[PDB]
């Protein structure tokens, strides 16, 4: 098991791809998944050792390219929307 | 002048109350925010 790091995964045949973290989501004794208003798999519980892992989408973001008009420069400053600056 | 000030000062006050004691003043704003979100979920559910 790996944490805080985007991975593919399968749990118990539940699959998906996410960022598995440590979560206080108190799952029920017999409850397997979690889910969410949008009906999208969220928390899971590690089948072997029983614990509440979040999930989290990967990143997305657009990529916006800030530029002063090419008439002025050739220098652009990319903007990665909506990420924390690492995965760059 | 004095009177008006009071009328106005008072008048302001009620607004707080009109707003505090009521969720149905802001329906409009409150609605837009729904219909959007309302329309997302729909969009999402379509995935399933």
């Amino acid at each position: 098991l790996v944490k805080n790091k985007c991975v593919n995964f399968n749990f118990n045949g539940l699959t998906g791809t996410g960022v598995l973290t440590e979560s206080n989501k108190k799952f029920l004794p017999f409850q397997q998944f979690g889910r969410d208003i949008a009906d999208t798999t969220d928390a899971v519980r590690d089948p072997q050792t029983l614990e509440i892992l979040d999930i989290t989408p990967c990143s997305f973001g657009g990529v916006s390219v800030i530029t002063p008009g090419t008439n002025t420069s050739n220098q652009v400053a990319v903007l990665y929307q909506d990420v924390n600056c690492t995965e760059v | 002048q004095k009177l008006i000030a009071n009328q106005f000062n008072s008048a302001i006050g009620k607004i707080q109350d009109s707003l505090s004691s009521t969720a149905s003043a802001l329906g409009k704003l409150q609605d837009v925010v729904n219909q959007n979100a309302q329309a997302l979920n729909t969009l999402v559910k379509q995935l399933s």
């Binding site: 969410d36 208003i37 949008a38 999208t40 989408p57 997305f60 973001g61 657009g62 929307q81 909506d82 | 707003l19 969720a23 003043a25 802001l26 704003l29 409150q30 925010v33 979100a37 997302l40 979920n41 969009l43 999402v44 995935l47």
Partner: peptide, 27 residues
Amino acid sequence: FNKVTLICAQKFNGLTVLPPLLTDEMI
């Protein structure tokens, strides 16, 4: 701002929510 009201709940499928140019602090 109280009388009115998940943000990333609908962000699972490319459905992003670009922040407004003007920020509720500027407004």
